[PDB]
Design a protein around this ligand. Sequence first.
Ligand SMILES: CCCCCCCCCCCC[N+](C)(C)[O-]
Ligand SMILES: CCCCCCCCCCCC[N+](C)(C)[O-]
Lengths: 285, 285
Amino acid sequence: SQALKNLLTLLNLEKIEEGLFRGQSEDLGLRQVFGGQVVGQALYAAKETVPEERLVHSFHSYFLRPGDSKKPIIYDVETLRDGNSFSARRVAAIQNGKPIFYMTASFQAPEAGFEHQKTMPSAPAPDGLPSETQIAQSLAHLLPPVLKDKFICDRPLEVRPVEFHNPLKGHVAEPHRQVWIRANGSVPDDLRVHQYLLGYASDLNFLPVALQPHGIGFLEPGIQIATIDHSMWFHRPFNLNEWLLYSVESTSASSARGFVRGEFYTQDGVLVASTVQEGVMRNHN
Amino acid sequence: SQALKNLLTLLNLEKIEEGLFRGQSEDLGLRQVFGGQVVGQALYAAKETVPEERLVHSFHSYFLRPGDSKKPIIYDVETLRDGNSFSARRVAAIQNGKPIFYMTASFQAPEAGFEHQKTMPSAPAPDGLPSETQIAQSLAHLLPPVLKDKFICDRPLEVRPVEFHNPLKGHVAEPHRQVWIRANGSVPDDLRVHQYLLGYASDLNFLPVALQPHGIGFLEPGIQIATIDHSMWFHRPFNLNEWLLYSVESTSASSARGFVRGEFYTQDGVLVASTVQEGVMRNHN
Ligand SMILES: CCCCCCCCCCCC[N+](C)(C)[O-]
Ligand SMILES: CCCCCCCCCCCC[N+](C)(C)[O-]
């Protein structure tokens, strides 16, 4: 459970000045910075500069350089606009004197209006599915004692895939994936926190779906995937303490790029948010 | 023919300086600037500052204020990055000393890579379908020609809807729409041009689809819709001199906002581009 509090602490940026923050990275595997961390932290920085009643409803972002998790990241927020209804902000993520990421987010106050939504796709309940932590721990029995011990996944989130796609091997399959996600611990009763946490989560089990028709795992040798842009629209309020289905599809792949679109639904079938991302996808020999 | 020539001319911006242009606004219908005009002009501006071999593959944009078509628009391009593969640019559309819109676009040179795509949805051929212009002429067989002798056919694009949704009245219908589109004249043999023309076109028959479940047309009195953000990914090359199916869906509407996702297909079924947009949707009484 320490993992979730460690993530929430990590997303709660250190203020250097108005609209100027500093964030730590890492710690959980792989040296490059996880895209979700940048998204989550950029969202925090952005919301800190917006009227409290205005919640993020959308954001667009482009990744320009790989982030180094050994170094902190500086987030500089620019106020683009504050109208009778919307507040827009642009966040620059900086490391080594260069922008590594830009996000533009829009915020709006709560309001009733036209309501309609796509019907949730059918998917088996999370109850009968193993978590990625279970799957990893089972695969770890393949490692020798020296390595088996040190490893282990204490995660801030719990993920139960409908179909498991091993990133180390990969098998041919339709460009669709469904995973169930929820916080592995208690998330504060503040919707804003749930939002940037979902922002964080939205970058998991996403881009890799574009590799399925080609049976390649994203961690295999010679395979390189990297996010170019990540966008999200928060349609309705939600509680990440409860399950959410992340329904993902890859409608296209071409010119060394992979494209994916996702949707988050509550177990009861409420459409909570939508996501879109394109990233580099190369097979180097 | 003239209408297409006029639009292409209007999209061909006047250069004030490097990465600094000036664009005129359409006379063609509606005092407020058509979003498509801004998108098309911003793309032109961006592409002018990019290496010739690198074609736009995606862009994100936000509209901050309504544009006045009675005035020109200044487009200021900022170079965000020029890497071994990708070039990124941010375009600011200014009018009245204020930004009315921002777009960030990414460009990449052609390359061979993983290929796969969603299967084109079923749709009738454009052959037996009347154009919107034809439909307008048909429904207009009434009232004094005094006004009927001014509003007519000449559009830069020909649009043939699979199902007609009258913006003036509107009827309840599932949140899906299909319209066939092609240039009404000859587009020069430059993919870049076809691309920003498609950008222009991508803002048509889009957002209104979110109003369908509610049986309201966007030209009805007291009904207000306005684009907040428009994004697009150019998956493959295409020829706007030929027919393209614009398949649109509205997966959600809430909090006075409407969300739509679109896809362009060649008649032969090739997925050419994807779009996503959210906009304000209000009924003022
Ligand atoms: C051996 C530990 C098991 C964890 C494997 C970690 C893989 C890194 C996954 C995050 C990569 C996300 N993405 C789309 C940007 O590639
Ligand atoms: C008889 C009136 C038919 C409408 C003529 C106006 C065409 C311009 C349409 C652009 C409107 C775009 N949108 C979604 C922002 O409303």
